[PDB]
């Protein structure tokens, strides 16, 4: 496995990361799941060409 | 703005990134996306643990 950097206002990480640690979900975890939806559905939420 | 470390497997990044960079969407972002709906929602779609 291998790490990557990611880049967000400080203010958002720390809402998202404040539910995920109070349902007992890792960070890590919380995006890993996310990399495979963005992987199978290939159209996401909002999928802004930015 | 800050910076975090994500882990995953590399074989699952690569379909991931594979797929939001030919949406044109940066990875940054779609990331940046999902830690709105986990803090929004506060459940995750499935918080599965292998």
Same mark, same amino acid.
């Given at each position: 496995?291998?790490?990557?950097?990611?880049?967000?206002?400080?203010? #958002?990480?720390?809402?998202?990361? &404040?539910?995920? *640690?109070?349902?007992?979900?890792?960070?890590?975890?919380?995006?890993? #799941?996310?990399?495979?939806?963005? &992987?199978?559905? *290939?159209?996401?939420?909002?999928?802004?060409?930015?």
């Amino acid at each position: 496995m291998g790490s990557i950097n990611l880049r967000i206002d400080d203010e #958002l990480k720390a809402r998202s990361y &404040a539910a995920l *640690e109070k349902m007992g979900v890792t960070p890590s975890e919380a995006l890993r #799941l996310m990399l495979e939806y963005i &992987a199978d559905n *290939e159209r996401l939420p909002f999928k802004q060409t930015l």
